Amino acid sequence: DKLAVLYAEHIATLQQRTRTITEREGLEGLVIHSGQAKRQFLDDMYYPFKVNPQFKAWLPVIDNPHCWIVVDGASKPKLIFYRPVDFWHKVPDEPRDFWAEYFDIELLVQPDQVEKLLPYDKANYAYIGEYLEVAQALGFSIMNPEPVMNYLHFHRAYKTQYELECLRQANRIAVEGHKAARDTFFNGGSEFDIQHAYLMATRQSENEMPYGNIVALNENCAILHYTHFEPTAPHTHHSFLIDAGANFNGYAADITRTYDFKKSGEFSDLIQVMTEHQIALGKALKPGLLYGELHLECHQRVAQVLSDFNIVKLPAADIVERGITSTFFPHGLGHHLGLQVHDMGGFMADESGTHQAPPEGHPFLRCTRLIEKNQVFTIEPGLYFIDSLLGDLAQTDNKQFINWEKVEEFKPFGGIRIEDNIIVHEDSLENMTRDLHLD
User: 165: closest CA among 12, 285, 6?
Assistant: 6
- Contact, 340 vs 167, CB < 8 A? no
Shortest reach from residue 415's CB to Mn ion, in Å: 14
Shortest reach from residue 171's CB to its own copies, in Å: 16
Q: 203 to each of 173, 190, 428, how far by Cα in Å?
A: 8, 20, 32
Q: Which is nearer to its own copies, 29 or 65 (CB)?
A: 65
Q: Is 90 in the site for its own copies (CB under 8 A)?
A: yes
Shortest reach from residue 39's CB to Mn ion, in Å: 18
CA distance 322 to 401: 10
Strands (E), 60-189: 68-71, 78-82, 104-108, 125-128, 142-143
- Residue 297: count other Cβ atoms within 10 Å of its Cβ: 16
Shortest reach from residue 203's CB to its own copies, in Å: 4
Could you say which of Mn ion, its own copies, none residue 254 binds, taking C-beta under 5 to 8 angstroms by partner kind? Mn ion
Sign of CA dihedral 19, 20, 25, 31: negative
CA distance 244 to 254: 6
Taking only Cα atoms into account, the Rg of the chain, rounded to an integer number of angstroms, comes to 24
* Total number of residues that touch its own copies (CB under 8 A): 64
Q: Give the strand pairing for 382-384 and 104-108.
A: unpaired
Per CB under 8 A, the list member of 82, 192, 309, 401 interacting with its own copies is: 192
Q: Is 427 in the site for its own copies (CB under 8 A)?
A: no
Could you say which of its own copies, Mn ion, none residue 5 binds, taking C-beta under 5 to 8 angstroms by partner kind? its own copies
Q: Is 91 in the site for its own copies (CB under 8 A)?
A: yes
- Contact, 371 vs 289, CB < 8 A? yes
CA distance 359 to 180: 39
Residues 232-291 that bind its own copies (CB under 8 A): none
Per CB under 5 A, the list member of 163, 176, 230, 243 interacting with Mn ion is: 243
Per CB under 8 A, the list member of 76, 203, 262, 399 interacting with its own copies is: 203
User: Residues 6 or more apart from 162 whose CB is under 8 A from it?
Assistant: 3, 6, 7, 9, 10
Per CB under 5 A, the list member of 22, 150, 368, 378 interacting with Mn ion is: 378
- Contact, 403 vs 311, CB < 8 A? yes
Per CB under 8 A, the list member of 340, 368, 421, 433 interacting with its own copies is: 340
Per CB under 8 A, the list member of 112, 115, 121, 388 interacting with its own copies is: 388
Could you say which of its own copies, Mn ion, none residue 262 binds, taking C-beta under 5 to 8 angstroms by partner kind? none
Shortest reach from residue 58's CB to its own copies, in Å: 15
Residues near its own copies (CB under 8 A):
1-2, 5-6, 8-9, 35, 38, 40-45, 47-48, 50, 52-54, 85-91, 129-130, 149, 161, 164, 192-193, 195-196, 199-200, 203, 205-207, 210-212, 220, 223-226, 228-229, 231, 330-331, 340-342, 344, 374, 386-389
